[PDB]
Amino acid sequence: LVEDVRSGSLEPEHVAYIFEKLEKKTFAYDEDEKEPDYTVHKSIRNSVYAYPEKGVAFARIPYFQDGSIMSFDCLFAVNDEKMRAFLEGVRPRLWEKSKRKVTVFTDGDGGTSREQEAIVREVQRSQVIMNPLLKKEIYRSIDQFFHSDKSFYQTYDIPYKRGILLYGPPGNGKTTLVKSIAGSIDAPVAYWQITEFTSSETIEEVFQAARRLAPAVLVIEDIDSMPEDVRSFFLNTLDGATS
């Protein structure tokens, strides 16, 4: 909803303000986010929004408690049918949005942290200098996986999953090849940043998150740096193929 309002999308309409003397506008600008968004739009807090086509409406109702300003997130629908269809439409909406952002999971102390970024230098496939046959075979497995439709994985009861590993002397195009794939496929790309805080709890969160994004590419740079006490669990998580 916030992104729809922020982007000037047509489909949510502003219906009313709740309190006359609380905020009527807001801005995206968060000094804690790496990318600064300076868009100014109508407030989310203290407003009512509706998706008339969908029969769903949002009200973020402010109230005063312990000094600070808080809000209830109230959700309204016209009937049960329209509410269910709205909810069933969230995963596909988020899938489309994620095709055009890059999702990064970074393992921190508590658990993993998810940020959506845009890539700083797009790398076109044509700028990836490589043995043309090696290059065509890598790009072809990726392109065939998402876009040739999978009569194969269905007729033979084989899990719809693939993994390739890039290795070699440093400075010769592993990261470059990976960056080139983000741009050039019609599916989300996610990066998993392994850290010293990578744990079995953290591997569980990334794969539950990644799989909600499926079909997608999950990139794991420097997979050698995965801690020893979670390698077993990680293998068991890959074999959790049903999901």
Partner 1 sequence: NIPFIYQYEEKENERAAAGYGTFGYLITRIEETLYDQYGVFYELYASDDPNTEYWEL
Ligand X SMILES: Nc1ncnc2c1ncn2[C@@H]1O[C@H](COP(=O)(O)OP(=O)(O)O)[C@@H](O)[C@H]1O
* Of 54, 99, 101, 204, the one binding a second copy by CB under 8 A: 204
* Of 124, 141, 154, 172, the one binding ligand X by CB under 6 A: 172
Strand bridging mode 40-42 / 25-27 = antiparallel
Sign of CA dihedral 118, 124, 129, 130: positive
No. of H helices and E strands in the chain? Answer: 8, 10
Strand bridging mode 217-220 / 56-64 = unpaired
Residue number, 128 or 203, with CB nearest to ligand X: 128
CB of 21 to partner 1, least distance (A): 4
Residues 82-111 that bind a second copy (CB under 8 A): 83-84, 87-88, 91, 102, 104, 106-109
Binding site for partner 1 (CB under 8 A): 14, 16-27, 29-31, 40, 45, 48, 59, 62-65, 68-69
CB of 64 to partner 1, least distance (A): 4
Which string of DSSP letters, residue by residue, matches 72-115? EEEEEESSHHHHHHHHHTHHHHHHHHHTSSEEEEEE-SSSEEEE
Residue number, 70 or 158, with CB nearest to ligand X: 158
In degrees and rounded to multiples of 5, residue 54 shows phi and psi of -100, -15
Assess 199 for contact with a second copy (CB under 8 A): yes
How many CA atoms within 13 Å lie on the side-chain side of 114?
A: 14
CB of 23 to ligand X, least distance (A): 44
Q: Residues binding a second copy: what is the number (CB under 8 A)?
A: 100
* Of 44, 56, 57, 128, the one binding ligand X by CB under 6 A: 128
